[PDB]
Structure formats: C-alpha cells, structure tokens
Amino acid sequence: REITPVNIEEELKSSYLDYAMSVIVGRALPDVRDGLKPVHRRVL
C-alpha cells in the first residue's frame, strides 16, 4: 500500500531514542581504557 497510518507517539519515541543512543554511545563520551573519543582515535 502507498499509504499506511502511524501513531505520532511511537514515531517520536523511536526517533528520539535512536538519536539519543547514537549521541551517547558514539559521539560525546570517552572510553575508560584509553580516554579517547572516536574522532580522536580515527585521526590518530
């Protein structure tokens, strides 16, 4: 089908949780073993 209904709450929750998890685990926090963010490690 071209059109499928969807509730707003589920879409909002899923999108925001995905973005929050991505930011928390991949962009802003350092690792305890080497103290580096992914960008620093990739540059090095």
Partner DNA sequence: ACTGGAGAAAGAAAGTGAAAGGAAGATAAAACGGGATTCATACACCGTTAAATACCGGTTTAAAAATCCCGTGGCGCGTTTTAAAAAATCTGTGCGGGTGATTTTAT
List contacts with DNA (CB under 7 A).
27-28, 37-39
User: Quick count: other Cβ atoms within 10 Å of Cβ 44?
Assistant: 6
Contact 30, 36 (CB under 8 A): yes
Our CB check for DNA shows the closer of 5 and 44 to be 44
Our CB check for DNA shows the closer of 28 and 32 to be 28
Our CB check for DNA shows the closer of 13 and 27 to be 27
Angle at 16 between CA 19 and CA 11, to 5 degrees: 125
Residue 6 Cβ vs DNA, minimum distance, rounded to whole Å: 25
